[PDB]
Amino acid sequence: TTIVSVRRNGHVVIAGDGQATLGNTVMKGNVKKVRRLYNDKVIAGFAGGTADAFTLFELFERKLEMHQGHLVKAAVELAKDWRTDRMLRKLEALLAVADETASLIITGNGDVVQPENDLIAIGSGGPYAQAAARALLENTELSAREIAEKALDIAGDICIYTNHFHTIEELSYK
Amino acid sequence: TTIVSVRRNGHVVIAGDGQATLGNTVMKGNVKKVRRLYNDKVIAGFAGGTADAFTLFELFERKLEMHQGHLVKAAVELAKDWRTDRMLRKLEALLAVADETASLIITGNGDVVQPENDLIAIGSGGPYAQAAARALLENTELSAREIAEKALDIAGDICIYTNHFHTIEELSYK
Amino acid sequence: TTIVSVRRNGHVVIAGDGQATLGNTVMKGNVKKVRRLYNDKVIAGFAGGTADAFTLFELFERKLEMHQGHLVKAAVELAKDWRTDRMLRKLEALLAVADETASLIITGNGDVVQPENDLIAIGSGGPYAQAAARALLENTELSAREIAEKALDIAGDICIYTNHFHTIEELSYK
Amino acid sequence: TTIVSVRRNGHVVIAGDGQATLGNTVMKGNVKKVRRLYNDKVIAGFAGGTADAFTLFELFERKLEMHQGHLVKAAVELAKDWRTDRMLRKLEALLAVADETASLIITGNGDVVQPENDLIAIGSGGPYAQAAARALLENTELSAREIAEKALDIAGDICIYTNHFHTIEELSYK
Amino acid sequence: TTIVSVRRNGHVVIAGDGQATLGNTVMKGNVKKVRRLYNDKVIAGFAGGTADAFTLFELFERKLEMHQGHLVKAAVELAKDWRTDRMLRKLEALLAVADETASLIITGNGDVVQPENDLIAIGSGGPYAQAAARALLENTELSAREIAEKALDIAGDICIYTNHFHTIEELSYK
Amino acid sequence: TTIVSVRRNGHVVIAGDGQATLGNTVMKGNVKKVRRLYNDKVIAGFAGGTADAFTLFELFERKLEMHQGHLVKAAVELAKDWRTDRMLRKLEALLAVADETASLIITGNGDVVQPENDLIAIGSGGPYAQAAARALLENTELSAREIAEKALDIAGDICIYTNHFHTIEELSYK
């Protein structure tokens, strides 16, 4: 899988492929790995269980309700329980989350990470996406969406665990 | 073991083989890997320990009356308890379940997958069944049951852990 | 060890050898692996601790008292706790149990298995016994007891972990 | 370490060596591996950690007053607590215990074995002791103690983990 | 990652690099591995998971008001909870902490070390930093900060897991 | 590390080196591994965490307060909790403890061991020390202190994990 997030000119996105793999074969080819949260204000993508998601995202929404849209805080509060609550402790995943404010990664370890330029590239294809995104972002006037898209393709092209089905979720603000 | 589920024209099936393997020897040849649940409105097949499947299916039923038979929603809760709870967490099994609304996989990794065309194929012989089922479903007017059966046999021919004993529960909703 | 059970002409039996092994040497050569239960109505054999037995069989007896001689039920109820009760969960073994009704295997996994023809062959020598029993049962008029016996010898002859000390327990009903 | 127990004419013994090994070096040479329990009416030897043995023997005594000194019955309960209980479950040790009614092994696997002639030989050097003890007991009029000692020394000659320091508790019931 | 701490003339520092590595790729380059605690009277660097460090540092502060800022005593308690407690016990991290009284390491193995001259160097690149820091501190009049920085860079040149991004918190007590 | 204890002519000692190792490098070279307890009546040395010590020694002191200076008893009572108390169970170490009465080793296993001649040699360099101590003690009129010292050097000379920093703690009584 490959989750790519990019932010340029009051535009932030999160794009992902749709391949789920079991051993050396493809189980499914159209997995939705990028959703939307907090009354379609907060976008997010992820790598993991379809339920872990539907549990980690629902909660995240509440943390946002308990911290007036302040992305970061809810995020900080999220990774908190996620590494503490006996039960929650078992869900494994990598949430990519971004709002007009900022974007970042949360990990079962409870970490909250803000990458160099709100550039996120998680998953087995993460680095190939990062490499292509970084390239584009530094040598062309392309858009945040055009980036993630193209970056994602490059990835699915290199990564044996990443395909070409996409699920993009933008966000305009300026 | 191979559990196959095809779905054509108001007809959805689930076929499994009946081999149980211990090491390199066949322990039982007529294992019933498919069965009905929720007043026969639901059909299911399972890879793994019979008793575990019994445990998991029972709870599934429970979750069904809980969510007025809404397969998915009731199914996702199961994806929950499964990975969260201590006892259940121990269970080793793969679930295949279908009704007239949709077919889908259920694993202990809080994952609830719904393949491309409700085409399910799990178990060591799963891919081979998928391969044949795909071909048949795209080059013939054959029926769900016809495909599932024929696909299952192909699986049994390829897969060293799948035999030719079958159990097929069907569901006609047309 | 090798536990063999056979049923022919209103006659059911369970036979076992008496070798306990530790590494590459014999600890004991006369272990009683086939007992009797439920007021000498229900016979049984097993592979495991001499205590696990004296705990799993005592309980099984009670489940029979809680289900009027109905073999299967108590059996089903047995494998139940055996995979649930925190403590009980640690006992490892393979109970072979049979009454005039039917015969079957219970495993720590909580499974209740009824083999093709009330033919049971558990233990490291299980398959060699099964092979010899199956042969005899299909090509000769021999008796349930003569079968298990001869089958058992064949086993102890092939199996480095099985000897020639026997403990047979029959049961006539017709 | 080798623990040997022979039993002839109202005379039953238990002899152990006294080596404790750490890696490839001898840590202690005079380990007392045999002792009395239950007002000297019971003798016991043990393979493993002294403190664990102390723990297990203490409880054994406890179980003895509990079942009017009935060795086996009181011994089987110990086979219980040992594998069931959390703390005890952790203990690594092999028990050899005898009185005037019988000799027998006790392991944390809910196993309570009573070898062919009350002839016990446990520990890395166990078999070699068994081998010699067998020979002596079947070609000489030697006594329990004479056999146990001589057998133990043979063990100490063969077994790299058994030395020639001995501790022999005897029991005369004649 | 390399965390370095040098201490010269009423000047004590702690410098870390900022690389986070995943497999063989750099995930983040500007990780802040050093920070202040206890009303800026205490400085600390850490090897490992940021969130874990956050958890551990928080508690450290707690222990400080508990023992009137006595570094060691308050630090040793932390060495306690860390290995004893269930949750904390899970945390993977190495702590480097200093104030005007002393510098010292804190690990989850109930170990609280205080190197030869308050010279601390932990993390995969720790030794290389130690090596250079030693040399500088014994053949030059350079300052704590000058040494720490220069040492850290040497580390970054040798250590494949340490980069050249720095974060240096200083403490002047002179 | 290497802890050496010796007793000759109303003189008992415990000596240790000061090397702490991490992988293939020295973390610290002057670790105090030999302290004093029970109102400077009871000496002790150890191999492990600097905290495990400061927890295992503090307690040991109390056991002495609960058993009127009687070394052994407190010792026996110590190794007791140390293998029982949920928390205490995690501390790993090897306490060498000696008073005018006697000297011995305690281990997380709960063991209390009194070596052949109040001669203790624990740690990776233990046997080399033992060999040199044994030699000296049997072929020269040297003193308990001179022994441990010389024995310790021999050790640090052979043992790659032992150095030449010493911490000796004597005790005269006659």
Side-chain angles (χ1 to χ4, degrees):
Chain A
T1 110
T2 310
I3 298 302
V4 185
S5 181
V6 181
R7 194 196 291 280
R8 204 194 219 187
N9 312 327
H11 279 321
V12 61
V13 306
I14 291 189
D17 75 315
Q19 180 178 320
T21 316
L22 199 126
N24 301 311
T25 72
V26 191
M27 177 187 345
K28 175 175 169 69
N30 54 193
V31 189
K32 195 160 300 171
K33 307 184 191 177
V34 184
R35 334 200 316 176
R36 275 171 164 288
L37 315 174
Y38 190 69
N39 316 71
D40 288 1
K41 298 191 186 73
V42 173
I43 59 177
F46 72 106
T50 303
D52 297 18
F54 223 111
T55 301
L56 287 174
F57 287 137
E58 278 203 350
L59 151 48
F60 185 63
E61 305 205 66
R62 286 176 189 162
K63 290 297 178 180
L64 287 181
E65 321 197 67
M66 302 178 264
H67 297 63
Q68 272 203 305
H70 188 291
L71 190 289
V72 212
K73 237 310 173 180
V76 199
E77 252 299 299
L78 176 54
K80 203 167 295 177
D81 298 304
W82 197 23
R83 76 137 196 290
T84 286
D85 184 291
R86 299 155 61 64
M87 280 166 46
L88 230 48
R89 292 182 300 184
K90 301 102 172 188
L91 317 115
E92 291 186 299
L94 272 191
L95 302 69
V97 86
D99 85 271
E100 53 186 66
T101 282
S103 48
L104 56 154
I105 304 167
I106 302 76
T107 91
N109 284 180
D111 283 15
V112 226
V113 176
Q114 192 151 200
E116 250 71 2
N117 298 282
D118 276 358
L119 178 54
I120 311 171
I122 59 182
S124 61
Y128 317 122
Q130 176 176 156
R134 183 97 77 68
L136 263 32
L137 207 58
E138 293 169 357
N139 295 291
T140 67
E141 291 313 341
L142 300 183
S143 59
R145 166 180 271 267
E146 274 166 338
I147 286 301
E149 260 291 352
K150 292 170 167 303
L152 236 186
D153 280 6
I154 300 293
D157 281 322
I158 297 301
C159 197
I160 242 62
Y161 295 106
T162 297
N163 65 31
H164 296 77
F165 174 85
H166 302 317
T167 300
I168 307 75
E169 288 301 349
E170 201 169 318
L171 205 63
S172 302
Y173 57 111
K174 291 82 184 309
Chain B
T1 132
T2 309
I3 298 293
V4 199
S5 175
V6 186
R7 181 196 289 263
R8 222 168 202 188
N9 349 293
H11 284 299
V12 74
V13 299
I14 286 185
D17 73 308
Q19 192 179 306
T21 308
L22 177 59
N24 302 314
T25 56
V26 182
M27 171 206 309
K28 197 164 180 293
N30 53 190
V31 180
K32 194 192 306 170
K33 309 184 181 182
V34 187
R35 40 168 296 188
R36 307 184 129 282
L37 309 146
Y38 203 53
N39 293 99
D40 288 339
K41 292 202 235 68
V42 189
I43 63 175
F46 65 101
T50 318
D52 299 357
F54 186 92
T55 315
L56 290 163
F57 286 146
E58 269 232 358
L59 185 52
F60 188 56
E61 269 162 350
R62 211 101 73 179
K63 299 299 177 190
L64 281 170
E65 315 190 59
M66 224 163 267
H67 298 52
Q68 267 228 293
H70 188 292
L71 209 288
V72 182
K73 224 294 178 175
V76 177
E77 294 293 296
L78 185 71
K80 286 171 183 279
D81 297 305
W82 199 336
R83 92 200 156 314
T84 180
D85 187 293
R86 283 183 162 173
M87 305 190 80
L88 297 62
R89 239 156 39 192
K90 306 185 177 188
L91 307 180
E92 298 281 18
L94 270 182
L95 280 46
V97 76
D99 77 357
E100 50 181 59
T101 307
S103 310
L104 55 84
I105 323 299
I106 299 176
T107 96
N109 302 174
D111 215 13
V112 174
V113 185
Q114 182 169 192
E116 256 76 14
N117 300 283
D118 271 14
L119 180 60
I120 298 183
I122 63 187
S124 67
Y128 323 121
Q130 185 182 159
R134 189 78 74 69
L136 258 42
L137 200 130
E138 289 170 351
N139 297 288
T140 82
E141 304 301 327
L142 291 168
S143 61
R145 168 184 284 276
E146 256 164 343
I147 290 180
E149 266 270 352
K150 290 175 167 307
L152 222 187
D153 279 330
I154 290 303
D157 286 339
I158 305 286
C159 186
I160 263 299
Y161 295 111
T162 294
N163 67 22
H164 293 82
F165 175 92
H166 299 328
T167 299
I168 311 85
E169 291 308 80
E170 198 173 335
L171 202 57
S172 292
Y173 63 76
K174 312 188 76 165
Chain C
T1 110
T2 310
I3 298 302
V4 185
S5 181
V6 181
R7 194 196 291 280
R8 204 194 219 187
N9 312 327
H11 279 321
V12 61
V13 306
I14 291 189
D17 75 315
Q19 180 178 320
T21 316
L22 199 126
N24 301 311
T25 72
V26 191
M27 177 187 345
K28 175 175 169 69
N30 54 193
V31 189
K32 195 160 300 171
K33 307 184 191 177
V34 184
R35 334 200 316 176
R36 275 171 164 288
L37 315 174
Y38 190 69
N39 316 71
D40 288 1
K41 298 191 186 73
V42 173
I43 59 177
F46 72 106
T50 303
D52 297 18
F54 223 111
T55 301
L56 287 174
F57 287 137
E58 278 203 350
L59 151 48
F60 185 63
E61 305 205 66
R62 286 176 189 162
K63 290 297 178 180
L64 287 181
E65 321 197 67
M66 302 178 264
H67 297 63
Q68 272 203 305
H70 188 291
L71 190 289
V72 212
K73 237 310 173 180
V76 199
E77 252 299 299
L78 176 54
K80 203 167 295 177
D81 298 304
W82 197 23
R83 76 137 196 290
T84 286
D85 184 291
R86 299 155 61 64
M87 280 166 46
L88 230 48
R89 292 182 300 184
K90 301 102 172 188
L91 317 115
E92 291 186 299
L94 272 191
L95 302 69
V97 86
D99 85 271
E100 53 186 66
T101 282
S103 48
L104 56 154
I105 304 167
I106 302 76
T107 91
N109 284 180
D111 283 15
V112 226
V113 176
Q114 192 151 200
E116 250 71 2
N117 298 282
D118 276 358
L119 178 54
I120 311 171
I122 59 182
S124 61
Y128 317 122
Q130 176 176 156
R134 183 97 77 68
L136 263 32
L137 207 58
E138 293 169 357
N139 295 291
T140 67
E141 291 313 341
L142 300 183
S143 59
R145 166 180 271 267
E146 274 166 338
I147 286 301
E149 260 291 352
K150 292 170 167 303
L152 236 186
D153 280 6
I154 300 293
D157 281 322
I158 297 301
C159 197
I160 242 62
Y161 295 106
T162 297
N163 65 31
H164 296 77
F165 174 85
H166 302 317
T167 300
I168 307 75
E169 288 301 349
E170 201 169 318
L171 205 63
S172 302
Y173 57 111
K174 291 82 184 309
Chain D
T1 132
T2 309
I3 298 293
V4 199
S5 175
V6 186
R7 181 196 289 263
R8 222 168 202 188
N9 349 293
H11 284 299
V12 74
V13 299
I14 286 185
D17 73 308
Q19 192 179 306
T21 308
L22 177 59
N24 302 314
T25 56
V26 182
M27 171 206 309
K28 197 164 180 293
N30 53 190
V31 180
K32 194 192 306 170
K33 309 184 181 182
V34 187
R35 40 168 296 188
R36 307 184 129 282
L37 309 146
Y38 203 53
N39 293 99
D40 288 339
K41 292 202 235 68
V42 189
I43 63 175
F46 65 101
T50 318
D52 299 357
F54 186 92
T55 315
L56 290 163
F57 286 146
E58 269 232 358
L59 185 52
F60 188 56
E61 269 162 350
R62 211 101 73 179
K63 299 299 177 190
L64 281 170
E65 315 190 59
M66 224 163 267
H67 298 52
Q68 267 228 293
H70 188 292
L71 209 288
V72 182
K73 224 294 178 175
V76 177
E77 294 293 296
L78 185 71
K80 286 171 183 279
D81 297 305
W82 199 336
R83 92 200 156 314
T84 180
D85 187 293
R86 283 183 162 173
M87 305 190 80
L88 297 62
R89 239 156 39 192
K90 306 185 177 188
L91 307 180
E92 298 281 18
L94 270 182
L95 280 46
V97 76
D99 77 357
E100 50 181 59
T101 307
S103 310
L104 55 84
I105 323 299
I106 299 176
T107 96
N109 302 174
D111 215 13
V112 174
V113 185
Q114 182 169 192
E116 256 76 14
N117 300 283
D118 271 14
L119 180 60
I120 298 183
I122 63 187
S124 67
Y128 323 121
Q130 185 182 159
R134 189 78 74 69
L136 258 42
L137 200 130
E138 289 170 351
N139 297 288
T140 82
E141 304 301 327
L142 291 168
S143 61
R145 168 184 284 276
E146 256 164 343
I147 290 180
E149 266 270 352
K150 290 175 167 307
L152 222 187
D153 279 330
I154 290 303
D157 286 339
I158 305 286
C159 186
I160 263 299
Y161 295 111
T162 294
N163 67 22
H164 293 82
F165 175 92
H166 299 328
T167 299
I168 311 85
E169 291 308 80
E170 198 173 335
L171 202 57
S172 292
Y173 63 76
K174 312 188 76 165
Chain E
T1 132
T2 309
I3 298 293
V4 199
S5 175
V6 186
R7 181 196 289 263
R8 222 168 202 188
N9 349 293
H11 284 299
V12 74
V13 299
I14 286 185
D17 73 308
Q19 192 179 306
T21 308
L22 177 59
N24 302 314
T25 56
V26 182
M27 171 206 309
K28 197 164 180 293
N30 53 190
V31 180
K32 194 192 306 170
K33 309 184 181 182
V34 187
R35 40 168 296 188
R36 307 184 129 282
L37 309 146
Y38 203 53
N39 293 99
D40 288 339
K41 292 202 235 68
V42 189
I43 63 175
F46 65 101
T50 318
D52 299 357
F54 186 92
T55 315
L56 290 163
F57 286 146
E58 269 232 358
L59 185 52
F60 188 56
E61 269 162 350
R62 211 101 73 179
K63 299 299 177 190
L64 281 170
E65 315 190 59
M66 224 163 267
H67 298 52
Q68 267 228 293
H70 188 292
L71 209 288
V72 182
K73 224 294 178 175
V76 177
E77 294 293 296
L78 185 71
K80 286 171 183 279
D81 297 305
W82 199 336
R83 92 200 156 314
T84 180
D85 187 293
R86 283 183 162 173
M87 305 190 80
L88 297 62
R89 239 156 39 192
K90 306 185 177 188
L91 307 180
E92 298 281 18
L94 270 182
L95 280 46
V97 76
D99 77 357
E100 50 181 59
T101 307
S103 310
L104 55 84
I105 323 299
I106 299 176
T107 96
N109 302 174
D111 215 13
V112 174
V113 185
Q114 182 169 192
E116 256 76 14
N117 300 283
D118 271 14
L119 180 60
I120 298 183
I122 63 187
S124 67
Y128 323 121
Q130 185 182 159
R134 189 78 74 69
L136 258 42
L137 200 130
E138 289 170 351
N139 297 288
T140 82
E141 304 301 327
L142 291 168
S143 61
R145 168 184 284 276
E146 256 164 343
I147 290 180
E149 266 270 352
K150 290 175 167 307
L152 222 187
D153 279 330
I154 290 303
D157 286 339
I158 305 286
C159 186
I160 263 299
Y161 295 111
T162 294
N163 67 22
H164 293 82
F165 175 92
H166 299 328
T167 299
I168 311 85
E169 291 308 80
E170 198 173 335
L171 202 57
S172 292
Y173 63 76
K174 312 188 76 165
Chain F
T1 110
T2 310
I3 298 302
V4 185
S5 181
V6 181
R7 194 196 291 280
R8 204 194 219 187
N9 312 327
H11 279 321
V12 61
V13 306
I14 291 189
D17 75 315
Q19 180 178 320
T21 316
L22 199 126
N24 301 311
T25 72
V26 191
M27 177 187 345
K28 175 175 169 69
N30 54 193
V31 189
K32 195 160 300 171
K33 307 184 191 177
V34 184
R35 334 200 316 176
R36 275 171 164 288
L37 315 174
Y38 190 69
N39 316 71
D40 288 1
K41 298 191 186 73
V42 173
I43 59 177
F46 72 106
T50 303
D52 297 18
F54 223 111
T55 301
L56 287 174
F57 287 137
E58 278 203 350
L59 151 48
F60 185 63
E61 305 205 66
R62 286 176 189 162
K63 290 297 178 180
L64 287 181
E65 321 197 67
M66 302 178 264
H67 297 63
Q68 272 203 305
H70 188 291
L71 190 289
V72 212
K73 237 310 173 180
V76 199
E77 252 299 299
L78 176 54
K80 203 167 295 177
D81 298 304
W82 197 23
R83 76 137 196 290
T84 286
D85 184 291
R86 299 155 61 64
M87 280 166 46
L88 230 48
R89 292 182 300 184
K90 301 102 172 188
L91 317 115
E92 291 186 299
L94 272 191
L95 302 69
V97 86
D99 85 271
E100 53 186 66
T101 282
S103 48
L104 56 154
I105 304 167
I106 302 76
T107 91
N109 284 180
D111 283 15
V112 226
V113 176
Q114 192 151 200
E116 250 71 2
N117 298 282
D118 276 358
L119 178 54
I120 311 171
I122 59 182
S124 61
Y128 317 122
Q130 176 176 156
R134 183 97 77 68
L136 263 32
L137 207 58
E138 293 169 357
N139 295 291
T140 67
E141 291 313 341
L142 300 183
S143 59
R145 166 180 271 267
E146 274 166 338
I147 286 301
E149 260 291 352
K150 292 170 167 303
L152 236 186
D153 280 6
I154 300 293
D157 281 322
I158 297 301
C159 197
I160 242 62
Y161 295 106
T162 297
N163 65 31
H164 296 77
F165 174 85
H166 302 317
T167 300
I168 308 75
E169 288 301 349
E170 201 169 318
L171 205 63
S172 302
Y173 57 111
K174 291 82 184 309

